[PDB]
Amino acid sequence: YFAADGSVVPSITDANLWVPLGILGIPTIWIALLYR
Amino acid sequence: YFAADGSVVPSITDANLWVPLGILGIPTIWIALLYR
Amino acid sequence: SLTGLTEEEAKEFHSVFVSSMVLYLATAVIVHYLVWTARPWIAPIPKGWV
Amino acid sequence: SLTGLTEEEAKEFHSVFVSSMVLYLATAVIVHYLVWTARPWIAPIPKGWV
Amino acid sequence: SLTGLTEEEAKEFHSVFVSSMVLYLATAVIVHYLVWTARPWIAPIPKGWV
Amino acid sequence: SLTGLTEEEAKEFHSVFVSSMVLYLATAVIVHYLVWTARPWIAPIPKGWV
Amino acid sequence: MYYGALANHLDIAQLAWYGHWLVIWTVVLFYLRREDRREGYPLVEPLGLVKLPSPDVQSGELPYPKTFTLYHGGTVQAPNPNRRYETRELKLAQTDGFEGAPLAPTGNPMVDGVGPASWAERSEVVDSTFEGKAKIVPLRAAPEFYIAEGDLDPRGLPVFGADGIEAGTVTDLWVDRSEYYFRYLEISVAGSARTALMPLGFASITKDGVKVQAILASQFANVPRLQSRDQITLREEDKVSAYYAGGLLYATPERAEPLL
Amino acid sequence: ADFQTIYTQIQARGPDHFGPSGQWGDIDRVGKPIFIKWLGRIGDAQIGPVYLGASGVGGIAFGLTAILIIGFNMLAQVSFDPLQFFRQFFWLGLYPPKAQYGMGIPPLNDGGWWLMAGLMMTLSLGCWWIRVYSRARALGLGTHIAWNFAMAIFFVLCIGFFHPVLVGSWSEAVPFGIFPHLDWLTAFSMRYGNFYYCPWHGFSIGFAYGCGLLFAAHGATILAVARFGGDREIEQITDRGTAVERAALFWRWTMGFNATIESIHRWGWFFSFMVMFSASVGILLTGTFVDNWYLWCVKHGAAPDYPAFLPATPDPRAGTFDPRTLTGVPQ
Amino acid sequence: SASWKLWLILDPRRVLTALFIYLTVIALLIHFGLLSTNRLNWWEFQRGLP
Amino acid sequence: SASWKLWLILDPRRVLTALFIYLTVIALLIHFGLLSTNRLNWWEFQRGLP
Amino acid sequence: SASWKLWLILDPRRVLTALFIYLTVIALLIHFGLLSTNRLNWWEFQRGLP
Amino acid sequence: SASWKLWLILDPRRVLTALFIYLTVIALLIHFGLLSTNRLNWWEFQRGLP
Amino acid sequence: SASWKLWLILDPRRVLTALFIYLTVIALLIHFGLLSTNRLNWWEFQRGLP
Amino acid sequence: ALLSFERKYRVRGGTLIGGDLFDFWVGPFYVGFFGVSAIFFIFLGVSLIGYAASQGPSLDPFAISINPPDLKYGFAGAPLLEGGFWQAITVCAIGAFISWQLREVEISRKLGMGWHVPIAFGVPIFMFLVLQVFRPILMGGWGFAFPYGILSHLDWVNNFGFQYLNWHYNPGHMSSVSFLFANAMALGLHGGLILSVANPGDGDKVKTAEHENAYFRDVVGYSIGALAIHRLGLFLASNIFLTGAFGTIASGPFWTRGWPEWWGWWLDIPFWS
Ligand code: BCB
Ligand SMILES: C/C=C1/c2cc3[nH]c4c(c3C)C(=O)[C@H](C(=O)OC)c4c3nc(cc4[nH]c(cc(n2)[C@@H]1C)c(C(C)=O)c4C)[C@@H](C)[C@@H]3CCC(=O)OC/C=C(\C)CCC[C@H](C)CCC[C@H](C)CCCC(C)C
Ligand SMILES: C/C=C1/c2cc3[nH]c4c(c3C)C(=O)[C@H](C(=O)OC)c4c3nc(cc4[nH]c(cc(n2)[C@@H]1C)c(C(C)=O)c4C)[C@@H](C)[C@@H]3CCC(=O)OC/C=C(\C)CCC[C@H](C)CCC[C@H](C)CCCC(C)C
Numbered sequence A, B: 001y002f003a004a005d006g007s008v009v010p011s012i013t014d015a016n017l018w019v020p021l022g023i024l025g026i027p028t029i030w031i032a033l034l035y036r
Numbered sequence C, D, E, F: 001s002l003t004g005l006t007e008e009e010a011k012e013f014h015s016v017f018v019s020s021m022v023l024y025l026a027t028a029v030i031v032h033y034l035v036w037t038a039r040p041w042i043a044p045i046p047k048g049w050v
Numbered sequence G: 001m002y003y004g005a006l007a008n009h010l011d012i013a014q015l016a017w018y019g020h021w022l023v024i025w026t027v028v029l030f031y032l033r034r035e036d037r038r039e040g041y042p043l044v045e046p047l048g049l050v051k052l053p054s055p056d057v058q059s060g061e062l063p064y065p066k067t068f069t070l071y072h073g074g075t076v077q078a079p080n081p082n083r084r085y086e087t088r089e090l091k092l093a094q095t096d097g098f099e100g101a102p103l104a105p106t107g108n109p110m111v112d113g114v115g116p117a118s119w120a121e122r123s124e125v126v127d128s129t130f131e132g133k134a135k136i137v138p139l140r141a142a143p144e145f146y147i148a149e150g151d152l153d154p155r156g157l158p159v160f161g162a163d164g165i166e167a168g169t170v171t172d173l174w175v176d177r178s179e180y181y182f183r184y185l186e187i188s189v190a191g192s193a194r195t196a197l198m199p200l201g202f203a204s205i206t207k208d209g210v211k212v213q214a215i216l217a218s219q220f221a222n223v224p225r226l227q228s229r230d231q232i233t234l235r236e237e238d239k240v241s242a243y244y245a246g247g248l249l250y251a252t253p254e255r256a257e258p259l260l
Numbered sequence H: 001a002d003f004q005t006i007y008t009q010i011q012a013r014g015p016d017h018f019g020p021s022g023q024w025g026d027i028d029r030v031g032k033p034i035f036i037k038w039l040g041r042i043g044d045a046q047i048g049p050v051y052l053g054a055s056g057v058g059g060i061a062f063g064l065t066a067i068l069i070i071g072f073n074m075l076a077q078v079s080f081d082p083l084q085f086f087r088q089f090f091w092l093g094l095y096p097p098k099a100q101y102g103m104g105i106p107p108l109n110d111g112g113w114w115l116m117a118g119l120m121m122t123l124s125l126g127c128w129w130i131r132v133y134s135r136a137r138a139l140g141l142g143t144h145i146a147w148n149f150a151m152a153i154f155f156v157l158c159i160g161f162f163h164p165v166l167v168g169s170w171s172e173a174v175p176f177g178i179f180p181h182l183d184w185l186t187a188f189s190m191r192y193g194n195f196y197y198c199p200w201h202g203f204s205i206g207f208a209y210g211c212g213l214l215f216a217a218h219g220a221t222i223l224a225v226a227r228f229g230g231d232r233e234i235e236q237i238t239d240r241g242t243a244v245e246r247a248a249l250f251w252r253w254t255m256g257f258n259a260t261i262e263s264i265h266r267w268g269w270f271f272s273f274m275v276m277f278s279a280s281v282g283i284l285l286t287g288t289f290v291d292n293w294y295l296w297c298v299k300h301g302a303a304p305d306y307p308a309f310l311p312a313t314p315d316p317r318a319g320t321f322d323p324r325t326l327t328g329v330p331q
Numbered sequence I, J, K, L, M: 001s002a003s004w005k006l007w008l009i010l011d012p013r014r015v016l017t018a019l020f021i022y023l024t025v026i027a028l029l030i031h032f033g034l035l036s037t038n039r040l041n042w043w044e045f046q047r048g049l050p
Numbered sequence N: 001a002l003l004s005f006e007r008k009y010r011v012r013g014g015t016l017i018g019g020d021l022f023d024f025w026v027g028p029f030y031v032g033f034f035g036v037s038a039i040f041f042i043f044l045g046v047s048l049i050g051y052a053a054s055q056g057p058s059l060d061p062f063a064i065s066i067n068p069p070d071l072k073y074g075f076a077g078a079p080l081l082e083g084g085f086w087q088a089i090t091v092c093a094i095g096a097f098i099s100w101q102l103r104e105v106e107i108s109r110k111l112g113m114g115w116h117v118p119i120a121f122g123v124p125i126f127m128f129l130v131l132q133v134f135r136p137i138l139m140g141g142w143g144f145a146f147p148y149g150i151l152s153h154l155d156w157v158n159n160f161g162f163q164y165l166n167w168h169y170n171p172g173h174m175s176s177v178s179f180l181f182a183n184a185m186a187l188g189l190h191g192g193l194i195l196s197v198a199n200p201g202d203g204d205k206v207k208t209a210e211h212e213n214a215y216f217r218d219v220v221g222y223s224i225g226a227l228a229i230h231r232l233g234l235f236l237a238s239n240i241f242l243t244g245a246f247g248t249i250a251s252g253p254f255w256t257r258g259w260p261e262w263w264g265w266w267l268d269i270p271f272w273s
């Protein structure tokens, strides 16, 4: 997110962070479940 | 959609978003059912 | 048969294949919604567009 | 048969093939309407067009 | 079988393969979060972007 | 026969082939009328044309 | 100031040029020439002046032998110690005392098997298909092989010698079953109860007949004989081919003489 | 004349037989062989069966995608006019970026499509190399062909990818097109000062001419001993007949030394490999460590000089512009 | 009336494949030829008239 | 009524493979063609517009 | 219904490897095409924006 | 689940070799593509910003 | 008339294929050649008139 | 001094001229009348090259250049330092090449071989004649020929090419280059295939001709065959020069414009403008 002085401060709450996590985490879950 | 300032605020209610979802979701449904 | 698979192998493979295809398509749908929240890529019709 | 399929196999394949092709074309129709709502791609005859 | 593996060899390889793949994907997820803390690479929509 | 079709297979294929060809040509006719309504592509002879 | 500089007048490309030459000449002299020496070496000096190393030791120019494991059986080495010595008592006499002096046949070189009529000491085995059958066989013994449709069938054609005299009649074709390629013509030779094989390369074939520049008609009688009727060994192939090749130089005395 | 060495007069036909079995993939050996008659005159008449495999499909898919990208951009170059596409085909091209973007991914309109096509072609070559290698392994053969092929692919990467990386600019890479990629040859030679003065250009040409000489000599040699069964080279390797003894003696009496029926193939492999190896080294040296090959040769004393025939004319711009502007951006 | 006998000699599969390819080539030629004009191009903004 | 008999001659696998390749090529052609225009390009910032 | 019988004719190994390659091709095309735009490139600093 | 039966038709050794090659290609493409940018290059001094 | 005996020697399939290709080539030449002229191009806006 | 299988092949006869006079070997070399003439021309030409280089501006091996006369001299003998040495060395080179080819004919006659190798060697000799004799004759002087020097003959090739503004568009050149590349690739394939069959791996069996056919039928769907690949290699190698000669001889005598403009025969067809 943007902090004081308009400088980025990364965090687990950044909305865009859930584009990669979703792309990576979601298959990783069901791959772990469907093929066992 | 366009906010009061003309900025872009994406949302599920965006009309254009239903072009990709429609292209992706519709086969995803009937593929699930035709070959169920 | 033509592919060497037995009937039960055909049924098992069909089940898994359809499940995987649908799961991949559904995660693609979810991912595309998330990306739209990141970048709404089909812009509205601009002012002078015809 | 030249293909090796039997009559019942050919009938089942024909049923599913025609269903799949029709469903594909129908989603093509619906999608094209949605795209037209996004971009009405055949503009009307312009002012001086002959 | 076509590959020459026995059923037990196939099962052993499958368990090891799925375990390795899941471990690899999970460390990818953790590593991608760490990188995001170093460089949050999907910027928010900038001003004037449509 | 040289193709492997029997007499009745040849007749049935001929019937479906002709029906498909005629339907394709007819929808082409209708589509050309609709396109003409969209774009009257054969303009009348312009002024100084000889 | 510059990329690639190693001194005032030393740069990377200059060194890489000499490195490239080193690569080329090391590969050529250290490896390729050693490979070239896997047949016919060590060299022999029948009329030499000095003592050479014994032919049965690894004398320094010789590569260490490699082993080919044959598809259908045992092994061969290269250099081959069994092919090292040739023992046939060639019918040839020196025209002069030194090794660089050519030899002259002592009579009937084509039959003797010297000069262009020389044959190598190949293994006396029938070359085979990868399925284990004899590779080169007459069409009478391979009914599953045939001349392609519309191609000239030479069976029944008259065979004429180099002197234009009719020498025989084509009786059969011999096909290579691995390659699907015709390699020999079998010829019933006039004046005997005897068939002679001829490599298809020595035959000029028309619808009228086949003509053989290589040998006279009368010399077809002395073509080397197959021990079996419907198969041929590798050494037999060498002998049969070398007979006609020797005829290229020996069929008539004029063929061995210069223009001027 | 041995007319068999010119063509095959009497073609042979036989059973439709499966080839030697591979360790895997016999299931993927597909197609009913067809026999075309004119082809059997100059070679084997039989077409097929062909092996599908996974790597073959990958090669086809990536290659067709690259071809589609190139062809579509060519078609766009004539504004989609089909007759003009047909007329102008040889002059059409998909070009790498014309502006300087460094190694950054360029826009679609100025090199992005070129980059996507280059990547697709690279992946198709990778898949086809896998096919070459693994078919050699499956049939129990050595992988010599695959390593020669690898050297060729490496040269393709040098001129399309590696040199742009080393100097830092996609604009240096080869465009796709019939006449355009030759245009690149000339422009690249000029930029780096006459490739005729690049020693590795000379090595690559020496080995290419050497391939011409070696294949002419070896093909003519095998044809000349074809009446002794010289073409059956594997058997001669394992049990040497008079054909290869005569071949060896011909070359020995001609030039004082000779190969064997096996080692002449090592010579051929080496020469073909060295074409690509020398070319790759030359391209990797160019621009990164040498800017002007002619001036490099002059520095190292190799370049000839000649008297002027017409009067010698000094540079009329001498000392009027900054020499950094020749190859560098002014600002 | 004996036209069906054509399929006794002309191999329906070959004709279907040839028609598929042929009509595709014609359609591509027409669509791309129209797109190369200003008057009948429907993709791009209108050109060729003020 | 007898259309299913097509699959006794026309080989389902060949048709499915050919359609897959054909429709992929057509789709790529259309998406690339639209991307090459100014009016219907949906990726880049709108240009070519007065 | 009888859809699993597809794998009695259509050879699951070839299908799975072909799909892997095909989806790789499309994914690479999309990712690198997007990186070739100003509007939708997520790696670089935003360009082409007034 | 019969997922392990996949290894009876897909040759684990070639699968592992292919996956090693594929993931190496992807990793190299990503690392070097990021290095080709100003924003996400982590080797060089930061460029592309005031 | 004994003209029909031509088909005892001339192989109707060869003639049909030859005519198909031949007439297609002629028609393509005519259509695209006419489109290469100012006077008879019916697709584009009229050009080459004062 | 002899290969272990050699002695039976060293028989008299097969010479074109000289008979028993020069029909002998020196070490491994067969001599003959044309071996004698080849040594004569080789020694004379190399010695003339040496002396002429000694009189040039640089003795660096790559900078040595022996050049033909000026165009004004036409076909006349030039002063030795001004093109006459080039003329003498050209004559020596032609004599050496032809002597070598004819000695190859004698050697192949002695061995009962086909004459394919000297006939194939005829092709580069013919290209040399096209470059140094036939095209100079059509252009009107020995001054159009290339000079003798490692880098200077490259300068001649370069400037000859740019005299027609882009030599890449020469159709004969396009054919010649296609054959050059095809030949190098085919030699790589053929060497690799033979070596792969004879050298499968660690303790593995030498494979067969059926394996050769199977490999290429798998990879590309076609196998040309064992004899046919040698025929094809000879064909491609020969066609490098056989089709290049047309572009070379045409450049100037049959075409004075830039080579790219020659393709106007296609581009400027009135039907498609
Ligand atoms: C800017 C100018 C260019 C140019 C100018 C050009 C000209 C003018 C000509 C060619 C020709 C040729 N060019 Mg081209 N060139 C080629 C390749 C080729 C060849 C395929 C072809 C034939 C070469 C030849 O005739 O040698 C001749 C070699 C001979 C004659 C060898 C003779 C050997 C002799 C018989 C025996 C000699 C033995 C030794 C003396 C003995 C050594 C003793 C040992 C012991 C040491 C490529 C692949 C390229 C690329 C990559 O762009 C290219 C670019 C250019 N060429 C530039 C664009 N080139 C020729 C051609 O055919 O064009 C249509 C030709 O005339
Ligand atoms: C010094 C050594 C050299 C050398 C060596 C070696 N070279 C090899 C090998 C070795 C060792 C192999 O083992 C390999 C092979 O297998 O051999 C049989 C191969 C190969 N060298 C080819 C081409 C080649 N070598 C050149 C040069 C040298 N090689 C130099 C000289 C040149 C030049 C100079 O231009 C060319 C063009 C292919 C035939 C083949 C790879 C196929 C491929 O990677 O396929 C990849 C697959 C595709 C691109 C898919 C294609 C799909 C269709 C058919 C295409 C589109 C059709 C569609 C209808 C669109 C129409 C338009 C379209 C036609 C435009
Ligand atoms: C299309 C077919 C082709 C082909 C074919 C074949 N090629 C053959 C044969 C066949 C079939 C043989 O049978 C014969 C041989 O034995 O092989 C071992 C031979 C040979 N190919 C040589 C060189 C070669 N092939 C080239 C090209 C092709 N080859 C094309 C590709 C090229 C190129 C392109 O540069 C070169 C340099 C020699 C090594 C050898 C001749 C020995 C000779 O002739 O001995 C006699 C002469 C000498 C040993 C020296 C003569 C020196 C004179 C007097 C003084 C120098 C004069 C000279 C003009 C100076 C030039 C300066 C320079 C800087 C500009």
Ligand SMILES: COC1=C(OC)C(=O)C(C/C=C(\C)CC/C=C(\C)CC/C=C(\C)CC/C=C(\C)CC/C=C(\C)CC/C=C(\C)CC/C=C(\C)CCC=C(C)C)=C(C)C1=O
Binding pocket: H054, H055, H058, H122, H123, H125, H126, H127, H129, H130, H134, H149, H150, H151, H153, H154, H157, K017, K020, K021, K024, L010, L011, L014, L015, L017, L018, L019, L021, L022, L025
């Ligand atoms: C350094 O030495 C080398 C060379 O010299 C330079 C080379 O040229 C080469 C070959 C070529 C290159 C390096 C240039 C092109 C290479 C690039 C871009 C990197 C390497 C990439 C490849 C070799 C191929 C690229 C292919 C892909 C990314 C698609 C991968 C998909 C595949 C293989 C099919 C999907 C299937 C699966 C993942 C599992 C199932 C697979 C099978 C049943 C069969 C697979 C078979 C095998 C043998 C792997 C190699 C390999 C080499 O080591």
Ligand SMILES: CC(C)=CCC/C(C)=C/CC/C(C)=C/CC/C(C)=C/CC/C(C)=C/CC/C(C)=C/CC/C(C)=C/CC1=C(C)C(=O)c2ccccc2C1=O
Binding pocket: H213, H214, H217, H218, H219, H221, H222, H244, H247, H248, H251, H252, H254, H255, H256, H257, H258, H259, H260, H261, H264, H267, N026, N029, N030, N031, N035, N036, N038, N039, N042
């Ligand atoms: C008294 C008196 C007058 C004496 C004179 C004696 C005399 C004539 C001496 C001549 C001395 C001279 C001039 C020697 C020069 C010899 C020459 C031209 C040497 C050049 C060697 C070069 C550079 C060759 C280039 C080609 C090359 C790389 C060849 C290496 C590979 C080899 C050996 C190819 C030949 C070769 C081929 C092509 C096969 O197909 C084949 C098939 C089966 C078995 C063996 C062979 C084989 O050896």
Ligand SMILES: CC(C)=CCC/C(C)=C/C=C/C(C)=C/C=C/C(C)=C/C=C\C=C(C)\C=C\C=C(/C)CC/C=C(\C)CCCC(C)C
Binding pocket: H067, H068, H070, H071, H072, H075, H115, H117, H118, H119, H122, H156, H157, H159, H160, H161, H173, H174, H175, H176, H177, H178, H181, L029, L032, L033, L036
């Ligand atoms: C690090 C990052 C981020 C990325 C790296 C990507 C990468 C590895 C890129 C590699 C690029 C490379 C190796 C490029 C090399 C290119 C080279 C060497 C090209 C050379 C020559 C090309 C030629 C001669 C091409 C000719 C092409 C044609 C004539 C195609 C014709 C096509 C058709 C007729 C098809 C028509 C189709 C129809 C629908 C319109």
Ligand SMILES: [Fe+3]
Binding pocket: H218, H222, H233, H265, N190, N194, N230
């Ligand atoms: Fe060979």
Ligand SMILES: [Mg+2]
Binding pocket: H079, H081, I036, I037, I038
């Ligand atoms: Mg237009």
